[PDB]
Structures are given as structure tokens and as C-alpha cells.
Design a protein around this ligand. Sequence first.
Ligand SMILES: O=C(O)[C@@H](CO)OP(=O)(O)O
Ligand SMILES: [Mn+2]
Ligand SMILES: [Mn+2]
Length: 503
Amino acid sequence: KKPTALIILDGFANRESEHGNAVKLANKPNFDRYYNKYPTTQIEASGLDVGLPEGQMGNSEVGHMNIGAGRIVYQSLTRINKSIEDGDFFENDVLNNAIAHVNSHDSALHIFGLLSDGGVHSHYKHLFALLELAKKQGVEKVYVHAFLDGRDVDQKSALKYIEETEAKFNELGIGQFASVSGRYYAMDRDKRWEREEKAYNAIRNFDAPTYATAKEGVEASYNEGLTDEFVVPFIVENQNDGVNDGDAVIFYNFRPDRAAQLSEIFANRAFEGFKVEQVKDLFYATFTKYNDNIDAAIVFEKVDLNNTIGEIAQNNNLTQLRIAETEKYPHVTYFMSGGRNEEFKGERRRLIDSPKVATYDLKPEMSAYEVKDALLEELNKGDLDLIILNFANPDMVGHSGMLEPTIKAIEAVDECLGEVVDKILDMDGYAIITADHGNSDQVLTDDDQPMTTHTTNPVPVIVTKEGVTLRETGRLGDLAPTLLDLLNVEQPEDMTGESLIKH
Ligand SMILES: O=C(O)[C@@H](CO)OP(=O)(O)O
Ligand SMILES: [Mn+2]
Ligand SMILES: [Mn+2]
């Protein structure tokens, strides 16, 4: 068996400036020799090319999903944005049923969510689209329960989103703020139920302070030293008639982890965090499915990915190995397989333990040498068709925002890379050396401060096949089609990416 390997250098991208660029400052002779001998291009790993909004840096989860799927895998924000822009949203069955529920019970429509443009948990423009829909179907009025951010956005920005939303209410002729809670309260994820109860009591017009306007209560918080995230939940005077039997709730958050708890309070009949009298005939709609214990109608259902690279390999009777250290093991397993834990037939996996340190600058080599030795051990068995390998280090050490450790990390990876790839080449196989998004290409601001984040830069691709030229650009969703090309395996239609290899 001639092996073909995808070797993912996590958080390793192409950036022109050398300043604070560990990728360019590192001595990486093995990478450079392959780069100088073999065909090379660069592909996009951020924004719309990976199913994220324009301007948004790529990441490990999204990047490994796109890589394994061989297509653009649209994430929640973009999917909902596109649904709005193209009209589907306003036809959505769950949203129109929530409105039929209100109209048929003469009851009230409530809207919960994180009122910012952070884009991690929500996007407040989706609130405006719901208000437009409610107005269109004649709802009359809509109680909006605002959860303030200050964490995925500037710590004191709530007043701008509140102002703009107040103008929407006037413009569209519908809706009002009913309650206002910092996300510390409404969006806990550590089962601190006393924080949640305060949000719940405001939303319900039970126990809470009241202010005449959303602005007033936020400004009162500011004057006390409590910024957006920490606003103590409050009620907006005369604008909150409670959540009563017959009502409907739409929760526009799309990220499960911080929306689940509040949703359990309203809509898990088994909820025991604190004692409640649940609303009867409550229509409870969540933008996504937050967990299995919430009785909700799901506005945007999870889409399963058929014919990821691993499934195609299976269906061609090929064997495959997924391998990485702990820190990127879910990436090369679960995410690579399209969000599936189960092994395919023919699949085996190798987990190497990551060191137990708070920040990986303390051991820049991490477990890269043990990953390399496990891999050499597997390739010496001679029974692998496909290998999916990730070297975690450039991303994990780069997050430290420290240049010398990040350089050392890349240099350790380079030494391992040369042993892995030379072995693949002795076995008459092929490697694609690339990345899932950038990070280590920039670990310093232009003013020499630590920079601890991913980048939007395009990622390198080297394909260790002679006599071929690569296409000039492309995206992560093109990698799996390139592996299939190298394996001489037919690409199915639902893999819409294109081989980077020119024919
Ligand atoms: O709550 C979350 O999941 C987001 C914050 O927007 O990340 P973290 O909480 O870990 O900052
Ligand atoms: Mn990554
Ligand atoms: Mn990262």
C-alpha cells in the first residue's frame, strides 16, 4: 500500500510581513526543501471560503469540518444570513407556526437573544428579521428580552445596539424591550442557577429592579461600575406583561452552550435547578437544537454531511488513520468525519497525550515527537491507504503571543515533518502539507505587543507529487478532492470542492 497523507500544520499561514511571524523566522529546512522541490499553492481558510462571514478568521473546528467534507460547510451565522437574504427565513415553518400559536391563543410573542453583532452566539440583525416577519403576519406586539454582550464585542457597546433596536421598533412599527440582562446571568454555562434565576425573574416580570427604558437601566449599571456583560437583570416599566399560558418564545441564539440553561428553565419539564411553575401551552422555538432535554421546535436543523473523505475511503475499501495529540484529536476525528464520533470501517485512530500545561510556550515541542514516532510505527505496518495527521504546535504555542517559543514549536514540527514525509516518499506515497487556518504567522502586533489570535491569512499547500502543477488559489474544501485525485478514487457529486491538481 502506497500511503497518501494529509498533514495539517495547525495555525500556520502565509503572511508577507516578517514582523512577529514565527513561520518565516523559524529554521524549517524540511518544509523549505519540499516547498522548493514540489508543487505549491495557497488556499483560503477564513471567511466565506469556509462558511463563515466575510472578515472572520478561520478556526480549528470549522477548518477541520471543511477539510474533511470536501465542500464549503456553511456555519450557523452564514446559513441564517443567507436564509434571510434569499427569503427562505420568512417562509420558515417553525417561525410561522410560533406565530400561528400566538395568533390562535390571543397571546404574546417573546424574543430572547444576545443583542450584539459578536457573531459567536447570535447576531442582532436576526432579531430585526424576526420583527419584520412578526409584523408581516400581523402579530401586533412582541416582547424582546435583551441579553447584553460586552464579551464578543467591546465591553461597553450595549447602548449602541439598544439605540439601533429602539429605532427598528419605531421604523417597523412593532416590538419593545421587556427585560434586559447581562449575559453573565442569562447565558451562564456552568449550572450556576442563582445567576440564571435573576434573568428568569426579570423576563417573567417577577422579582427584579425596573427602569423606564433599556438605556436608563444600562446607564445606571455603568454608573455603578457594572459593564454590559454584568448588567443585573431588569424589567422595563410598563413594557413587560410576563410570560403567560399560551405565549410563544423565539430564542435567536444559534450557539448551544450558553442558551441551553435558560431554555431548560422554560422548556425542560424535568428542570430541577430551582423550583418553577412552567408556562402552559408554551410554544418554544430555538434557532438551533441546544440539547435533548429541551422541548423545542428547531428553526434550523442540523445537516448531516454525507461523503466526507473518511466515508469515501470506507466505500472504496481503503484503510485510514487519524492521528494527533490531545489538543487536535477531536479535529482529526469528530470534525474531520463531519461531526461524527463513530469510526468508519477501515478507520483506526491514535491519540497521543498532550502535555498538561497551562500555556504551551512551556513546552513548545509539545508531544510532536511522540506523534511522529507513533506515525512511523503505523506506516511500518504497510497497511494504510490514507493518513490524516495534525501537528498541533504552531496554533497551540502561537496562542501564547510569544515569538521565541512559537519559533521553537515550528522548528520541532519541521524536524518531525521531515521524518514523516521522507518515510511516505520511501513508500512511494504522497503527502499534502497544509494548514487549517493561520495563527503563528503573527504573534506580535505591529507595536510589539502579544497577539494571541488566529489570522485571516491564506494557508500553504505542498503536494509531494512530481510532474504536476497546482491551481493558483482555492479553499479548504478543495483538499479532500485533491487527496481523492492522489488516491485515484472517484469523487462523488456532493463533494463540490475541486482537486488542486491541474489536469
Ligand atoms: O460563551 C462562549 O462560549 C463564548 C463567549 O462568547 O466563548 P467564551 O465563553 O468561552 O468566552
Ligand atoms: Mn486549527
Ligand atoms: Mn486555536
